[PDB]
Amino acid sequence: KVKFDQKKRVKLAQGLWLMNWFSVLAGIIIFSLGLFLKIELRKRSDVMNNSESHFVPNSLIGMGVLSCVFNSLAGKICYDALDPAKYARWKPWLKPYLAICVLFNIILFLVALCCFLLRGSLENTLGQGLKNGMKYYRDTDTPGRSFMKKTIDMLQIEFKCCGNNGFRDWFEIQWISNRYLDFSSKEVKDRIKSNVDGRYLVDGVPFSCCNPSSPRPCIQYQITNNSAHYSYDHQTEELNLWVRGCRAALLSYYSSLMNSMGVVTLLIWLFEVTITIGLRYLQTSLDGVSNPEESESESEGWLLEKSVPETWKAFLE
Amino acid sequence: LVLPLQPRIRLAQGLWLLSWLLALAGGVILLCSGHLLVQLRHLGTFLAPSCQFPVLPQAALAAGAVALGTGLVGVGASRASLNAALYPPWRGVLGPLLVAGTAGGGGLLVVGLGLALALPGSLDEALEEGLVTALAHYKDTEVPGHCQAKRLVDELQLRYHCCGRHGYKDWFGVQWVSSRYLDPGDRDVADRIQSNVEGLYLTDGVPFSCCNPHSPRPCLQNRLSDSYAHPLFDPRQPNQNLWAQGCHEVLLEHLQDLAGTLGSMLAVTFLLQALVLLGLRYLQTALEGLGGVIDAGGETQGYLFPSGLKDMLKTA
Amino acid sequence: SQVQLQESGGGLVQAGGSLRLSCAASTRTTSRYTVGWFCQAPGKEREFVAAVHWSGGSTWYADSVKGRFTISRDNAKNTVYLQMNSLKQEDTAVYYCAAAEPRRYSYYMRPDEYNYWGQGTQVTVSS
């Protein structure tokens, strides 16, 4: 518990108003950040499957909107409390207000924890989408698929990635259209005969897989053939091509983004819980004071004047 | 000019809102200057050392800071109008502060406009020299002091969808593979080295960064001069493989666009600042007669100069 | 279709004389084509002689023939003209006019770059 006077109460109300405006600012900024995450995720929708992992952004947007509206309501409550006559009409809504603020805080903590926990699900869907894009890479001319090659190449270029897990997948999967390949070529015919189910599989990667930092010009063909080049060895040299898979790269990038968002949400949660504590203390002071009009008279404010075991029985009833 | 009280209040409100717009202009110009600076962070290597273009962002940052300061001073003027008693403590300093702000803002903004209208012309030859220097330093990825050349050139190409200064073809005429990685046992390589003067290794090929993702076919990076070297390539302009436009061209266009946008922003900010300062000076001279009391209805005369123009000339 | 370049003007001349050579294309986009000339004689390989580019204000020749030769372009006729001045016997050779798609940053050119090649014309200088 704690004592209270008119000056302490008015100073507390002023601080509540100021921190409520700060919380409105926090709500709008988190809204903007959630929208930014939403658009960023939508940007890479094509490379991955059409729709996947669009729950955290919507939750963030809704949470921001709720935070702003509730902060405005609490600011109006503080403004009314500044005048006991104005607050008089608010007497029968204080307990519901405390309850709904408590629920808001719990759901805020839940979404904060989910912002960290939910990262696992996106991995499988992203990997499947990347595999589908790689499969559709070769057949550019097909309708509704030409964009796939461009999307994959741009993603690799801008994320410094190479395929699902490096270049072994690129070796496994064909990535050159049949039409642009000479079927009369002796070596091409030999390769197609050697490979089952036809198709053309040559150990190599598209130009995007190349690493700019490599001192040598990037090698994209006969990579496994050690003797095919000069002073080179695929086992030893790594700078030639990016080694981190695109699945891992995208996962790490989105994980960093979501962790930053979670930190921001946790800070907002601290602010909201502080606001709730202030509201609870103000309500306790207003209850302790004999009458609201006797603002000059001293009052007492607490958090809960009921012992934990007593509250345990009271809730049971 | 005799200023009645109601137009005085209306002009104070107008000055407040104008100062708000001036502060916003300062903020946006500062943001644009920072954007240009960060863009130049990874572009200086491609600018000729003799060029002075990077000084324009430096000047623009100061100009935007001064503009924002003037906007904040206008906000303070609005606050003083709100609280007349708050002006007197801000009476003596206000005059010299306004004079210094006018001088600094005018000088900084004029310098920024002059730089924005002069420097961009040199960008042509600046890039002309810088890209050639970078390409000539592309090969030596091992020699210290130039190791970043290859990485920076490749990043430029990939980011801005370009090949060489203008075009790609005679890239064959500049060696782009360090001799350290050439096999001495290749008869063709030895023959090319002997044939070409200076020992430079010239090959009909291009680095991977020169490719285009839009290409329906896998990128081609060797024997580009021969029509039959590949199943479908020909000298006829192919949309596939390499880019069409050249770096020098794309970079020049982009930098000129940024410079023009920044110059337009500087011009609008200068006009806004001139208007704000004119209004603030009129307000100051008007309230000087009132003695800082807004409620006073003495109809003070607002004149830009403290006295006649000839008086200023004589005082010189 | 595929462009065709035709050269004309080749003929016998005396030592120290001058001559005119005209190379003509067939497309309507010649203004953007970058053009060059090469001369080759028995016992010697193809060598650069003169170049012209998009701008038209840029002209470059081998040091061995700097100034002595002149090269110009006429967009109206889509023609490339080369004037031989102060000819010498060693200049006797077959000339080829070459046209290529815009390569606008190596103001110097080599045979590895050009795409369209005319048949050429033989010029002989006699003392």
PDB file of C-alpha atoms in Angstrom, chain A residues 182-309:
ATOM      1  CA  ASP A 182      21.414 -29.002 -78.925  1.00  0.00           C
ATOM      2  CA  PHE A 183      20.046 -32.551 -78.892  1.00  0.00           C
ATOM      3  CA  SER A 184      22.242 -33.541 -81.848  1.00  0.00           C
ATOM      4  CA  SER A 185      25.387 -32.884 -79.797  1.00  0.00           C
ATOM      5  CA  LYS A 186      27.238 -36.120 -79.094  1.00  0.00           C
ATOM      6  CA  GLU A 187      28.072 -35.233 -75.488  1.00  0.00           C
ATOM      7  CA  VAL A 188      24.536 -33.999 -74.788  1.00  0.00           C
ATOM      8  CA  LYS A 189      23.083 -37.217 -76.194  1.00  0.00           C
ATOM      9  CA  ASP A 190      25.509 -39.261 -74.097  1.00  0.00           C
ATOM     10  CA  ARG A 191      24.505 -37.353 -70.963  1.00  0.00           C
ATOM     11  CA  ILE A 192      20.783 -37.762 -71.636  1.00  0.00           C
ATOM     12  CA  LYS A 193      21.296 -41.481 -72.254  1.00  0.00           C
ATOM     13  CA  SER A 194      23.314 -41.878 -69.049  1.00  0.00           C
ATOM     14  CA  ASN A 195      20.715 -40.046 -66.959  1.00  0.00           C
ATOM     15  CA  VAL A 196      17.493 -41.928 -66.279  1.00  0.00           C
ATOM     16  CA  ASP A 197      14.175 -40.455 -67.437  1.00  0.00           C
ATOM     17  CA  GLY A 198      16.071 -38.402 -69.994  1.00  0.00           C
ATOM     18  CA  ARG A 199      16.512 -34.801 -68.870  1.00  0.00           C
ATOM     19  CA  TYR A 200      19.882 -33.005 -68.812  1.00  0.00           C
ATOM     20  CA  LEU A 201      21.837 -33.038 -65.538  1.00  0.00           C
ATOM     21  CA  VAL A 202      25.272 -31.388 -65.486  1.00  0.00           C
ATOM     22  CA  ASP A 203      27.123 -30.444 -62.306  1.00  0.00           C
ATOM     23  CA  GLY A 204      26.947 -26.659 -62.404  1.00  0.00           C
ATOM     24  CA  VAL A 205      25.099 -23.597 -61.174  1.00  0.00           C
ATOM     25  CA  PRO A 206      23.480 -20.510 -62.657  1.00  0.00           C
ATOM     26  CA  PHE A 207      25.484 -17.304 -62.663  1.00  0.00           C
ATOM     27  CA  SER A 208      23.575 -16.005 -59.635  1.00  0.00           C
ATOM     28  CA  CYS A 209      25.177 -18.676 -57.442  1.00  0.00           C
ATOM     29  CA  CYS A 210      28.584 -17.086 -58.079  1.00  0.00           C
ATOM     30  CA  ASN A 211      30.310 -15.141 -55.301  1.00  0.00           C
ATOM     31  CA  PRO A 212      31.699 -11.705 -56.274  1.00  0.00           C
ATOM     32  CA  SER A 213      34.482 -11.908 -53.683  1.00  0.00           C
ATOM     33  CA  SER A 214      36.093 -14.930 -55.349  1.00  0.00           C
ATOM     34  CA  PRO A 215      39.543 -13.969 -56.707  1.00  0.00           C
ATOM     35  CA  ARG A 216      38.974 -16.216 -59.723  1.00  0.00           C
ATOM     36  CA  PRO A 217      36.170 -15.803 -62.246  1.00  0.00           C
ATOM     37  CA  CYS A 218      33.352 -17.904 -60.856  1.00  0.00           C
ATOM     38  CA  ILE A 219      33.311 -21.479 -62.140  1.00  0.00           C
ATOM     39  CA  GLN A 220      29.841 -22.681 -63.121  1.00  0.00           C
ATOM     40  CA  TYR A 221      30.591 -25.869 -65.089  1.00  0.00           C
ATOM     41  CA  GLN A 222      32.735 -28.941 -64.465  1.00  0.00           C
ATOM     42  CA  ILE A 223      32.893 -27.736 -60.862  1.00  0.00           C
ATOM     43  CA  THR A 224      33.244 -31.283 -59.535  1.00  0.00           C
ATOM     44  CA  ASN A 225      35.896 -32.060 -62.166  1.00  0.00           C
ATOM     45  CA  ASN A 226      38.998 -30.990 -60.244  1.00  0.00           C
ATOM     46  CA  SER A 227      41.287 -31.340 -63.267  1.00  0.00           C
ATOM     47  CA  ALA A 228      38.911 -29.263 -65.415  1.00  0.00           C
ATOM     48  CA  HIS A 229      40.571 -26.024 -64.238  1.00  0.00           C
ATOM     49  CA  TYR A 230      43.917 -24.705 -63.000  1.00  0.00           C
ATOM     50  CA  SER A 231      45.008 -24.569 -59.353  1.00  0.00           C
ATOM     51  CA  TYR A 232      41.530 -25.400 -58.099  1.00  0.00           C
ATOM     52  CA  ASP A 233      39.812 -27.970 -55.894  1.00  0.00           C
ATOM     53  CA  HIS A 234      36.095 -27.990 -55.125  1.00  0.00           C
ATOM     54  CA  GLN A 235      36.661 -29.700 -51.773  1.00  0.00           C
ATOM     55  CA  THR A 236      39.090 -27.024 -50.568  1.00  0.00           C
ATOM     56  CA  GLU A 237      38.013 -23.752 -52.183  1.00  0.00           C
ATOM     57  CA  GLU A 238      34.711 -22.327 -50.961  1.00  0.00           C
ATOM     58  CA  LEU A 239      34.778 -18.650 -51.932  1.00  0.00           C
ATOM     59  CA  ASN A 240      33.933 -19.571 -55.535  1.00  0.00           C
ATOM     60  CA  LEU A 241      30.240 -20.051 -54.706  1.00  0.00           C
ATOM     61  CA  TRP A 242      28.147 -19.101 -51.706  1.00  0.00           C
ATOM     62  CA  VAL A 243      27.931 -22.126 -49.423  1.00  0.00           C
ATOM     63  CA  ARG A 244      24.911 -21.174 -47.291  1.00  0.00           C
ATOM     64  CA  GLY A 245      21.642 -22.537 -48.620  1.00  0.00           C
ATOM     65  CA  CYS A 246      18.895 -20.116 -49.547  1.00  0.00           C
ATOM     66  CA  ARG A 247      16.470 -21.807 -47.160  1.00  0.00           C
ATOM     67  CA  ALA A 248      18.871 -21.112 -44.294  1.00  0.00           C
ATOM     68  CA  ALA A 249      19.604 -17.568 -45.480  1.00  0.00           C
ATOM     69  CA  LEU A 250      15.940 -16.579 -45.758  1.00  0.00           C
ATOM     70  CA  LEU A 251      15.155 -18.282 -42.454  1.00  0.00           C
ATOM     71  CA  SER A 252      17.940 -16.397 -40.671  1.00  0.00           C
ATOM     72  CA  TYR A 253      16.907 -13.067 -42.191  1.00  0.00           C
ATOM     73  CA  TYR A 254      13.252 -13.468 -41.232  1.00  0.00           C
ATOM     74  CA  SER A 255      14.316 -14.756 -37.810  1.00  0.00           C
ATOM     75  CA  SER A 256      16.334 -11.604 -37.167  1.00  0.00           C
ATOM     76  CA  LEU A 257      13.379  -9.505 -38.313  1.00  0.00           C
ATOM     77  CA  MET A 258      10.942 -11.360 -36.048  1.00  0.00           C
ATOM     78  CA  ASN A 259      13.341 -11.166 -33.093  1.00  0.00           C
ATOM     79  CA  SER A 260      13.596  -7.396 -33.507  1.00  0.00           C
ATOM     80  CA  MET A 261       9.808  -7.218 -33.698  1.00  0.00           C
ATOM     81  CA  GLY A 262       9.537  -9.322 -30.553  1.00  0.00           C
ATOM     82  CA  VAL A 263      11.922  -7.031 -28.684  1.00  0.00           C
ATOM     83  CA  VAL A 264       9.869  -4.002 -29.720  1.00  0.00           C
ATOM     84  CA  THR A 265       6.667  -5.753 -28.655  1.00  0.00           C
ATOM     85  CA  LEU A 266       8.221  -6.637 -25.293  1.00  0.00           C
ATOM     86  CA  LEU A 267       9.111  -2.991 -24.699  1.00  0.00           C
ATOM     87  CA  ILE A 268       5.550  -2.006 -25.596  1.00  0.00           C
ATOM     88  CA  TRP A 269       4.349  -4.670 -23.158  1.00  0.00           C
ATOM     89  CA  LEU A 270       6.451  -3.137 -20.391  1.00  0.00           C
ATOM     90  CA  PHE A 271       4.879   0.235 -21.165  1.00  0.00           C
ATOM     91  CA  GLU A 272       1.365  -1.227 -21.171  1.00  0.00           C
ATOM     92  CA  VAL A 273       1.862  -3.069 -17.879  1.00  0.00           C
ATOM     93  CA  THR A 274       3.214   0.109 -16.285  1.00  0.00           C
ATOM     94  CA  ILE A 275       0.133   1.974 -17.524  1.00  0.00           C
ATOM     95  CA  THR A 276      -2.116  -0.745 -16.106  1.00  0.00           C
ATOM     96  CA  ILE A 277      -0.356  -0.574 -12.738  1.00  0.00           C
ATOM     97  CA  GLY A 278      -0.829   3.190 -12.696  1.00  0.00           C
ATOM     98  CA  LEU A 279      -4.526   2.823 -13.492  1.00  0.00           C
ATOM     99  CA  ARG A 280      -4.944   0.213 -10.756  1.00  0.00           C
ATOM    100  CA  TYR A 281      -3.232   2.470  -8.219  1.00  0.00           C
ATOM    101  CA  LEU A 282      -5.381   5.437  -9.253  1.00  0.00           C
ATOM    102  CA  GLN A 283      -8.544   3.357  -8.883  1.00  0.00           C
ATOM    103  CA  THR A 284      -7.421   2.124  -5.463  1.00  0.00           C
ATOM    104  CA  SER A 285      -6.756   5.705  -4.358  1.00  0.00           C
ATOM    105  CA  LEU A 286     -10.173   6.823  -5.610  1.00  0.00           C
ATOM    106  CA  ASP A 287     -11.768   3.952  -3.688  1.00  0.00           C
ATOM    107  CA  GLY A 288      -9.817   4.694  -0.510  1.00  0.00           C
ATOM    108  CA  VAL A 289     -10.670   8.392  -0.491  1.00  0.00           C
ATOM    109  CA  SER A 290     -13.958   8.890   1.342  1.00  0.00           C
ATOM    110  CA  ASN A 291     -15.391  10.867  -1.582  1.00  0.00           C
ATOM    111  CA  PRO A 292     -13.849  11.926  -4.909  1.00  0.00           C
ATOM    112  CA  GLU A 293     -14.810  15.535  -4.161  1.00  0.00           C
ATOM    113  CA  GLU A 294     -12.524  15.396  -1.096  1.00  0.00           C
ATOM    114  CA  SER A 295      -9.412  15.476  -3.261  1.00  0.00           C
ATOM    115  CA  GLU A 296      -7.619  17.529  -0.604  1.00  0.00           C
ATOM    116  CA  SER A 297      -8.210  14.761   1.940  1.00  0.00           C
ATOM    117  CA  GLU A 298      -5.598  12.020   2.100  1.00  0.00           C
ATOM    118  CA  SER A 299      -6.215   8.615   0.534  1.00  0.00           C
ATOM    119  CA  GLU A 300      -4.601   5.188   0.250  1.00  0.00           C
ATOM    120  CA  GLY A 301      -3.754   3.224  -2.877  1.00  0.00           C
ATOM    121  CA  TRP A 302      -2.594  -0.367  -3.160  1.00  0.00           C
ATOM    122  CA  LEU A 303      -2.411  -3.273  -5.606  1.00  0.00           C
ATOM    123  CA  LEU A 304      -4.578  -5.806  -3.754  1.00  0.00           C
ATOM    124  CA  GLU A 305      -5.720  -5.598  -0.127  1.00  0.00           C
ATOM    125  CA  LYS A 306      -6.755  -9.281  -0.112  1.00  0.00           C
ATOM    126  CA  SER A 307      -4.408 -12.074   0.923  1.00  0.00           C
ATOM    127  CA  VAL A 308      -3.534 -14.596  -1.774  1.00  0.00           C
ATOM    128  CA  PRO A 309      -5.222 -17.566  -0.011  1.00  0.00           C
TER     129      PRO A 309
END
